[model samples]
Target: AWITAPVALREGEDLSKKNPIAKIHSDLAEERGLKITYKYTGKGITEPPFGIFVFNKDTGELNVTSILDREETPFFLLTGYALDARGNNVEKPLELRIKVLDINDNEPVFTQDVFVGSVEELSAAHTLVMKINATDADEPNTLNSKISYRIVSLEPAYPPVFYLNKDTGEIYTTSVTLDREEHSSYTLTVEARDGNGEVTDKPVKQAQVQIRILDVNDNIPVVENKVLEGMVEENQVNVEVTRIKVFDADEIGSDNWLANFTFASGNEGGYFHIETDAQTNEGIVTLIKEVDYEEMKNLDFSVIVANKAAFHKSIRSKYKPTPIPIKVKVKNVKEGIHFKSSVISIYVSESMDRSSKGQIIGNFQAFDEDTGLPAHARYVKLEDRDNWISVDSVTSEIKLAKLPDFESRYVQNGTYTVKIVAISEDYPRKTITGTVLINVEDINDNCPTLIEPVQTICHDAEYVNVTAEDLDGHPNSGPFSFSVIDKPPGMAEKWKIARQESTSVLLQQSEKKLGRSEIQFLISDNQGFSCPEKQVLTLTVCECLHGSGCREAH
Candidate 1:
């Protein structure tokens, strides 16, 4: 007897995606070889080497001759061969074939159709009014392309107001506040793709949603104007004067509140009062007592409006009462301060030579409204008691009879604001004063003074320093130019003076070595104050060596 098996076909093949695993059945292997001998050895009711069979000479049958039944494996080897007597090897090569098949074992899955939904025109994002979801169906635990889902039509056509998730089967708001008066409906399309979006196989799914836009109150009450105008007397009764009035678009009641009216000014007698009108949302003012024009004239004031509605209503209806300007002219005569004129003014020539005299010049005229006289200007005179300034007693004329040179007086001294009082000649001499500042004029009259009139320096003394003082300020007494008015013979070239330091002189550097016994120098303020003052400094130039006894030069 002889046997053979097929084996060449299993050399090249990959079958993972189509068929996951390979198996063998003893019934299918009956005629694969020249021999028929069966003995099951593996889990699949077939011996190892499934689809592979060996010939048994004595039994005269084929037997499974290779391993089989691998988990998730797709290729199977077919074996057949001829043999000599008693299962001996034949001289012919065995024929082999590997088979690859398909398996419906993989589960169908959906690619993440990552969706972004948006709502515009008066809608908040992320409102949970929609649902999203995905699906996959494979033989429970195997891979299959059976899962699919979709978003149907977003209905009604007039207003395009909604959207849906294609892979998730979710619907969400796309447009907000669909005005029924303008358009009543919305239409949209959503599609879901299945078969795992694979080119080999694909399925499209869809769904529809009908959206209805609901309405909510989100309005604010508006005022007509921010500023209101009215009129009221200064001392009017609280209920009689015109007050601020407000109109509200909302329902009228105590809860619809208005601000209180306040009188700011123009209350002549301090007797005008303000009150609110319950029926009209109006404020009123009345005269508590007769207004006195002698006090306040025109009145102006303000009023504030507020909302007293509940939180929700009040938030929507804010009442800001406007400020009202009220003016009430005084019907009675006003009694003001009795100045000579509406504005009593005086004029005097600014330039008059020293010791010169000028007249009492001013426009002075007054009226006494009553017999007692409101106010009056009686006489005028300088306020200074010192004889520097004086006014004639009866004529009210001013004369500068003293030294008015500002450099010697005002500049060196200080400043003062002078007041000229106008006295009333009437019985108690009621006086009202006006000020006229007599600013003193300057004339270069003073000169700089050397504080240290005389100074002496020894040859060993490091250096000599001097300072000057100016009673009169600069550009008058400051910095007198310095020079040697008279210089001793040897001192002429050796002695030097520095420019004046402020009002005085500062000696910046001294002579290194003195030649003669004494040296002289002159100092003078640039102004014509005095002849240059001369100072002689006695100097003994000591020819003393370092660490040697000192001796003076002849």
Candidate 2:
């Protein structure tokens, strides 16, 4: 039998070869009892060393098993065999050279040190922010050693408001606008790994990028207004006159122009006050006192605008100068003397002294408009020629000097006319005057006075009655308030004054009992203007049964 091997395999040239092989033989000769076998210099027919292969004793055939190839070596050895019904001569080894094929499995890798540039400030989006690169050691396109790229990690993620994309390596700001005062630099860690995150015999890579957020004076300092005005009244009320509204076009409620609004000049007399609304950047103005109209009416002031942020203050934009002009106005009117009512009417009692003797009661009032000055009345005089009355100048009070006798020849039942005047020392000499009609009322002043009356009642009697009157008139005067004073110890308590009728009063013994009681009583006008005389009564108490009549009076 004879055999041929694949080109990759050979007899033992080196001990490191590893491949499968086969032997060639005639199956018919084997079936006819022709025996054949082989011996090898290497390990054996099964589980043999690297370069051992099958051999034939009958045909002197040797076969190579495997190609010799190792990643760490240039070539390999193989052990071949032959036999001729003799002993084995397996001492030398067969060697073969195999060249390794380069594959594209590995990819380009980046170094650990990389240089990334910075943007002074990010004014626009995607403004080329970092850069990173790598290298490949293997052939460009083979499977085992080819190179490709990927950014394994970027210090900051994409769209650098303050961070950037790792693949493009464009460093930019992730922040809206980089404020130098707040942050100046950013520490970015960029990683450039091989095509599949590998950096070994296949490929190596790395990334290093430092991103810096820079500062720029791209923003202008905005002030709400260059001038503001406020109007205040002298001696103003408790409320603020006006407020100044200020704002910065910057961020809302950021205080960019809040703390900046300050009064620069003209707050004298402490008359003008200024305050800023912390949250809204507004200014308020208030006046402290009443200003005299004759005094300076208007005032001018100024306020300074400043920012706290360092770079925010150094911008090249024009700063707004706040010129606050406060105009104070004084209002003037009649300073003193005002009438209590638009008109006055006087009702004079017929008995009243029309010649300035009786009291004249009427509604009349005066006031002074001057804030701090007191008003004095010069005089109050009657302007009529009849001169039937007199009025006190200082008090503005009218008094009737003499009572009018209506029945006299000069007296009449009709109305009489009179004019009165009041004057005060207010600016423009304010004065008040009015006309009054004095009607002579027809009331009989000769109404009758009550006379003494006598009455008697039995002790413990139910009731007793008394009566009195004048000869002049009955309807003119009558029933009045009754009272008693200075009676015997128990006498006052034993008697009760009761109203019998419209014009009469009844004195009665207590329903209980009376012991030698003596009492006094009196009555007067219901109008509370009359003087009525007192009355005396006597009673004797008696013991009697509930159903019995009282004993007759003695």
Candidate 3:
């Protein structure tokens, strides 16, 4: 007995295209007058495509049941047997083999949705920017899996800027230069074809390639104006005179645009200061010393501005910046006779400490060098607007008419100001006015007083406002601290103080009712230099409804 089968068949061939691929023969079965039958048992035959190869029971011939795919099953093996009418094997089993041929059916695919690359701006032409790759799942080393890449479209429609290698998928810059300032990024549509030929109407796949143009230092910083003019008053020093603006073509806030300004020349005696303004990229020029109009009426200076980043070597020689020039003029004012001290300051102790009224606080004096006269020969008279201060009619001595009190609400910040006039009793009368600033020093002699000494609150009720007042101002005044002192046993536990302000607090009662508690509160000034003041608060705990007045707790 023997059997034969075809070794291979085209993968896409129709089942009807080929029939009776294998046949079985048995001479002993025919001589014994027994019928012969054949069956297949293997992977493609019995398991997946069950009964894919059918056999005629009486003729022992095999045929394909349905279409076959090489990708799914490349080959098939089956054991064939011959049987008689009684179902007993008549000869030894025979082995058959069949193979499916390869076909081009799959398309090339990209490994990722998008490819990203970066190149420094102003790079030379033909520089390799990035490489793209794709794969095909069909048979290797055959035309089915051979892949080719080509650029389909480029964004930013203009002169062509990039080139791609169809064979290797390598992207390169075409003679055009890339400027990050003009265009920061470029998007390219790339396609990968599976067959090795000119791209046709066949199926094709696409992916995105994004190229980022990195920034480079290529521009030089320059001043906005070539020349600037300003003016300054005589004796004006350490003051801002004018500002000069500078700019760079590159992006703002970048290293290439941040400029540093300096005095290149014409600045003498260190009398001028030049600095860069970070927010506006401008140069600020200031006068560092007084300008004497008699010495020189005009001043001139020059400033050189440069960026923090150095220019690229290609443009270094062509990008030299010019120095900016600035001019200033000095002005003077007419002179007049004035008092020795234009504004005088004096400190006085509180009224309680002053020993006597009309105490000599200080004196005011005037000078008139224009008058060629002796000091005693020139008589002077002084007067004030407020009667609280007075001066001698001829001696020019000033004194306080009355003592100052720190507790007086009329006094502000424990301070007072008075305008005084002084006149020289000479051939030509000359007068000058000046200010006398008097500050009253506090003496912690006053005690803190409560705004409300008696308060009525309910059990488990919200806090009641408790406030105290200090007559002394600032360091000697409020921002006062309050605390319960010498409290009865468990009395402190029955109430707590919640701060409302530095000078005020809220008194919260506990859950348990208290008939009446005489709690002593101590208040102290921020200075804390003197003993704290003690005041007793009479608190009555009551039960009350929202609409009705509170009554004594039962």
Candidate 4:
């Protein structure tokens, strides 16, 4: 009979060794003097698997005829019989069992044919991006199937941006920030290994993790070595100033690649505007209002540029818009026209009344004093800077064409002139030059402006004298009034102004202490024509010079 119901056997064992899987000794063969023949029958012993296991009839031994495969068939059951020189059983049959022992044979294999992962660009280190999974068929809980993961080689151009965990098979980002502009995706090999050692230290299995680094709008639009210029004639309106072009490194045609522009300075009057071209990605600087050449001959301003999309928060490095500088040159052509004489001077008021049909400023007749005769000659304009006056053709009577402004271009310090020709059937020599020099008297049109914009305070001199002068002359220029504008909300909190002598005002400190501070105020002439421009004044603390002003720091 068989030694036990079940027996242990090694998988992939040598068949030539003739090892018995289940040993048995027939009791009828040993107890009787008759020659006993024994046989074995089982699933793997006969029929389809007839060559694997064989039963010896003379010795009642169960031997393995071929190598055993534990993965295919781990265990088998069989029955043994004993007979006296026949094929029949001598007594009750004995049953047998065989169990195959497991070995470290199979290698690790990836569970999926292809691995996939995703991560945002500029991601933080140690952020998990993807998972790698694999398995082994040799054993469930032994060294054969205990797998760990490692990154072998990658397609990244720079240093490795990802790392794999040895036990978990999960991949994470390293210290390097992933920029989609630089490297969009990563294709790397992830190898799986078991607890048991290697072949050429050979990897058990390898798979590619296709990782895509998402776009993050991290690049700032930059302008470089720019040579932008704008030209506008004086007093011209609605002119395109210049085109602002810049470059960005984000994905093309996306929101992150487009640029946006804004004015950083010098546009307080709303005289200028800037907008981006969605199609060309360029900025157009435009002048929306008229610009005077006398006020500003050259214009300088700033523009700041950036991408339309919001930058990702994961990028720790700091970036600021280094503002772009622009320059414009205004052309000049507001002054001209000519003629001459002993000069007939006309005194006129600067006001132009709405209802006035060219007020007659003067009258004159061409006389030949030597010929003792008066000539009725026609008068025609020869030269006029602003064309402010006209003359009658037959009578040579001079009339005001339009009221004169003291600040007009040809005024040349309160005096504007026009020349006319008196002709007796005028040939080149028959025409005589007649000139009229009009002196325009001042009006209350100009506001008071400060001559000295900055002052200082000390212990001895608690107040600074600030003087303002109006462009108007004679009766209108005097005794200016000054008041704090409080424009940025709090100009009157710490400073006060008082009336000084004739053309000056007093700046007084109202606070207990003050640093180097700046303030704004409105200046109006004696006639109360407030200046259109806001005046600025800077106050500084300094040591006192008893008789004069602030002492120089040594």
lDDT of 4 by residue, 1-554 (tens): 43566777788768556466555665555566678787877778765566878777787777777888888886787777777664666768777777778887777789886899899887889999988888777757888678877777889735788888877888898988777988888888778887743535564578888988888787777765358877787778888887787788888788888888778887777878888887777887888888766555346788888777776554425676677778888877632211222578878887665323487778656764334245656667877766787788888777877777887777876788777776664333356776777888777888788887886677655677887877677568777777787756765876777556677777777663746777787777788787777788887776666776665657
What would the TM-scores of all predictions be? 0.38, 0.32, 0.54, 0.52
Order the candidates by TM-score, highest first: 3, 4, 1, 2
Residue 102's lDDT within candidate 4 is 87
Question: Which ranges of candidate 2 are over 4 A from the true structure?
Answer: 1-228, 255-259, 288-296, 310-554
Top candidate on TM-score is 3
- lDDT of each candidate versus the true structure: 0.44, 0.50, 0.74, 0.74
The local lDDT score (0 to 100) that residue 95 gets in candidate 3 is 81
**TM-score, model 3 to reference:** 0.54
Candidate 2 lDDT, tens digit per residue, 1-554?
22233334322244243422433344434565534344434332444444435555566455545433332332333344432234533223232222334333344455557565677553565455655555555444433333334444553344335444434444554447655445555555544444444545532445556666555433434445554455554446555756656545444444443445556777665666666667656566677656654345555666665543433534544545555454444556444565545456566555543433565655244545444333576556565455566677776666665664433444344455666666876456767665666665534453224344433334445666655442222343544556654466665655667665545567665546555555565545444344344455444456554677555465
Q: What is the TM-score (0 to 1) of candidate 4?
A: 0.52
Worst 10 residues of 2 by lDDT: 90-99
